[PDB]
Amino acid sequence: DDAVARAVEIVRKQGVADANLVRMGDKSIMFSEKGDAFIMYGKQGRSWIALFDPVGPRQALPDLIWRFVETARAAGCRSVFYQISPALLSYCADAGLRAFKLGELAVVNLANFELKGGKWANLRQTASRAVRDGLEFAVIEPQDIPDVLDQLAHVSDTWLADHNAKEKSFSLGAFDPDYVCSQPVGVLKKDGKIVAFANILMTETKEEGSVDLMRFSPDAPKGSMDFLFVQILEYLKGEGFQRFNLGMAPLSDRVGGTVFEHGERFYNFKGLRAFKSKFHPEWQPRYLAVSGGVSPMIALMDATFLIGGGKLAAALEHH
C-alpha cells in the first residue's frame, strides 16, 4: 500500500521538477478524488504544511486544496503551503489563504543559454579551468547507481563533515539509499573517483529540470560547483528540456526579517545568490500561504522546525 509510488506516477506526467521530492518518502500524500493529482505535506507544531504547488492537472486543484485545508482544520491545525508559485496565488486565496513572498527561484531558459556565446564569460572561463584540472562529467541512471553508491556516500559524508552539517528533511532531500538510487545523478570524476554529485530531478514532459542534493568531497577542486551546474544544464538542454531551476535564494519588519533568516538557513547550500547570478537567470518569486489570518511568522517557524527535523538549536551567526 504505497501512496508514494502512486504519487511518483503523477509526478512523471507533469512538468514541475521539484515535485520529485515526494520520492524521499517523508511526506504524507493526499490524492484528488480522481487520483490524478496530489498534495504532499508534513505536520509540525499546530500546522499542516504542504510542499510546493499541488501536483497534477489544474482542474483537480480547487477541490483538492479545499480538502487539504478542511482536513487540517478538522484536526485542530492551521494549513500552510510552502514555496508556491505565482500561478497558485489565486487558487490558494480562493481557499482563504494569504500569501507572503519567501524568496525567489533562479530559472535558466535552456534555449537561450550558450556557454561559449559571450554572455556567460565567468562560467565559460570557470568551465575551462575545470576541464584543465581533470574534471569529467557523467550522468548515471538509477540501476547503475548501486555500483557507485560507496563513492557517492564518501562524497556525501565528507561534504557533511566538511561543513559541520546535518541532514535536513521535508523540502530538502538527504543521503538515503532508496532515494539516492531512484533518480539519475550527475557526477564529477577526477583521478578515477567521483568527487561530486547531484541528483537530477526530471519528468517525462521535459519541461523543467532541477537538482536537490549536491555535494563535494575534499578532492573536488575550486570551481567544481560551477562546472557541475553547467554540465547538468547542458545535459538537460541536450535532452530537450525547456528550463533548469537552480534553486531558491533568500529574500533580496519582524515578518520580513524572519523570512530572510529562514532563507539564509536553508537556501544557501548549493551556491549563494551571487553564484546563481552568474547564470543571468530569470528570478521567479515563491510564496508561503497561510490560513486563518495567522501571521506568516508562526507558519515559517514551524517550517523551520520541520525542515530541521523537529529541531532548532539557535539563531544563525550574524554580526
Residue numbers in the entry: 542 to 793, 805 to 871
Q: What do the paper's sentences say?
A:
The crystal structure of the catalytic domain of RtMprF in the C-terminal region has been solved at 2.0 Å resolution, and serves as the initial model for building the corresponding region in the cryo-EM structures of the full-length RtMprF. The synthase domain of RtMprF (Pro539-Gly860) superposes well with those of PaMprF and BlMprF (root-mean-square deviation of α-carbons at 0.977 and 1.297 Å, respectively). They share similar tandem repeats of the General Control Nonderepressible 5 (a histone acetyltransferase of a transcriptional regulatory complex) related N-acetyltransferase (GNAT) folds (GNAT folds 1 and 2). The potential binding site of lysyl-tRNA in the synthase domain of RtMprF is located at the cleft between GNAT folds 1 and 2, according to the previous studies on an alanyl transferase FemX involved in peptidoglycan biosynthesis (in complex with an aminoacyl-tRNA analog) and BlMprF in complex with L-lysine amide (LYN).
